[PDB]
Every structure is written in structure tokens, then in C-alpha cells.
Amino acid sequence: PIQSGDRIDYRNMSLISRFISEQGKILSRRVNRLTLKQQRLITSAIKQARILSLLPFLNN
């Protein structure tokens, strides 16, 4: 079903913001139904993006 065919990075924000919660929290692998490898890369990405202010730690 859902899959990643395009390279995931910290700069594809559509990609990452699919996997982020309303409050900015990162969703678990069980919910997102991704391979372990995937979820790890997602997570590192979300964090690196978080440092560059592409995505917020907390909300406004």
C-alpha cells in the first residue's frame, strides 16, 4: 500500500509532515506501518529539519 519511492530527506517537507503529529511529535513505527530502516531515517530527518527551523519543536 503506502510506500516511499522518492528519496526521503530533511528537505521534503510533505514527506516528513505526513509522519508528524498535530503537536509536532513524531509518530511511532507501528502507526506509520514502515520498515524499521525507514522509520529510523525518518526520525533522524525530522530532528535535523527541526534544528534548521523547517519544522517546529513546539507550536505557536
Residues 12-41, mask of contacts with RNA (x by CB under 7 A): ---------x--xxxxxxx----xxx-xxx
Show Cβ contacts of residue 56 under 8 Å, excluding neighbours closer than 6 positions: 24, 50
Please say whether the beta carbons of 37 and 29 come within 8 A.
no
23: closest CA among 53, 51, 59? 59
| Site for another protein, residues 1 to 60, rule: CB under 8 A | 4, 7-8, 10, 35, 37-38, 48, 50-58
Q: Least distance (Å) from RNA to the CB of residue 15?
A: 15
β-pair partners for 20: 26
Residues making contact with another protein (CB under 8 A): 4, 7-8, 10, 35, 37-38, 48, 50-58
